[PDB]
Design a protein around this ligand. Structure first.
Ligand SMILES: [K+]
Length: 320
């Protein structure tokens, strides 16, 4: 009840765990509502919460327009999950171009030649594909469609990227949970979820062929390989899709916290920063246990330098 955040369901598993551990350690009570990145952005701007979580980072100009400060907390993977007869987790391989053509509505069956080409070992059925996407404004959708735009020209020009897009086709699930539930129950379903949702629900994720041509499974190692080399020190706005590493999982994103740079309630901002400072210091095993990737120590040091300079009371004095 002490501080309240809302937004990204991508980050909800670790924020919820961090908040429980923090309160057990003696820290304030942290309530986090999983409403989607777009809903979280609306609520921090409406100043109905103390911070928002979003996996669709704002550019410098939008942050200045809104008076918000933004910083990353962890990195996570996004995986295709499917419901295909005779196919178990990790057995099927897809690719960026193929994912784009599936979401374009061009590939309609699971025995399509473009899927078959990537799956010599799998006895594919002729099941119709049932496309599932997010109904709510979503940072997971942003990562997904940012990625599709890089690897499928038709998708880039016809649909593009955003927390919402004009999907050519697809059932709309609310949150990562709603997409997960649709995929597990609709035969032939394909969807996209943050990795923790696939693992918790024992979902059938796919491998992906990355830009190097390596078939990579989704796992801590390949998420981490994607995050390598990001220039955090230049800008916190960093998009980690279709990364060039040979073991890089293709669909990865950081997730972000937004709070007002001028704190109407300085003690609220201080408690928010206190919570994430504690999480950076003490929550690394919790993040790893959920297969998120923790930020490098040097990046967390830079974030601390920035939030003492940039999150202040109305007089310009640091809240931390
Ligand atoms: K085959």
């Amino acid at each position: 009840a002490d501080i309240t955040g809302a937004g990204s369901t991508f980050a909800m598993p670790i924020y919820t765990k961090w908040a429980a551990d923090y309160q057990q350690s003696g820290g304030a009570k942290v309530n986090y509502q999983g409403i989607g990145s777009s809903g979280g952005l609306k609520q921090i701007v409406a100043k109905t919460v103390d911070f928002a979580g979003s996996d669709a980072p704002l550019k410098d100009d939008e942050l200045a327009k809104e008076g918000l400060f933004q910083f990353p907390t962890v990195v996570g993977g996004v995986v295709p999950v499917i419901n295909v007869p005779g196919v178990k987790a990790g057995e099927l391989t897809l690719s960026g171009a193929v994912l784009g053509d599936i979401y374009l509505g061009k590939i309609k069956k699971w025995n399509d030649p473009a899927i078959a080409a990537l799956n010599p070992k799998v006895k594919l059925p002729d099941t119709d594909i049932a496309v599932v996407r997010r109904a709510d404004g979503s940072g997971t959708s942003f990562i997904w469609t940012n990625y599709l735009s890089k690897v499928n020209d038709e998708w880039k020009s016809k649909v593009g990227e955003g927390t919402t897009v004009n999907w050519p086709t697809g059932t709309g699930g609310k949150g990562n949970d709603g997409v997960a539930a649709f995929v597990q129950r609709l035969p032939g379903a394909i969807g996209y979820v943050e990795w923790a949702y696939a693992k918790k629900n024992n979902m059938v994720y796919t491998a992906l062929k990355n830009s190097t041509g390596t078939v990579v499974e989704p796992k801590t190692e390949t998420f981490k390989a994607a995050a390598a080399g990001a220039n955090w020190s230049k800008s916190f706005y960093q998009i980690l899709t279709n990364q060039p590493g040979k073991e890089a999982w293709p669909v990865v994103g950081a997730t972000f916290v937004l709070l007002h740079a001028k704190q109407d309630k300085p003690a609220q901002g201080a408690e928010t920063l206190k919570f994430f400072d504690w999480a950076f210091k003490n929550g690394a095993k919790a993040a790893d246990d959920l297969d998120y990737i923790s930020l490098p120590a040097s990046v967390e040091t830079e974030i601390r330098k920035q939030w003492k300079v940039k999150v202040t009371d109305a007089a310009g004095k640091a809240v931390a």
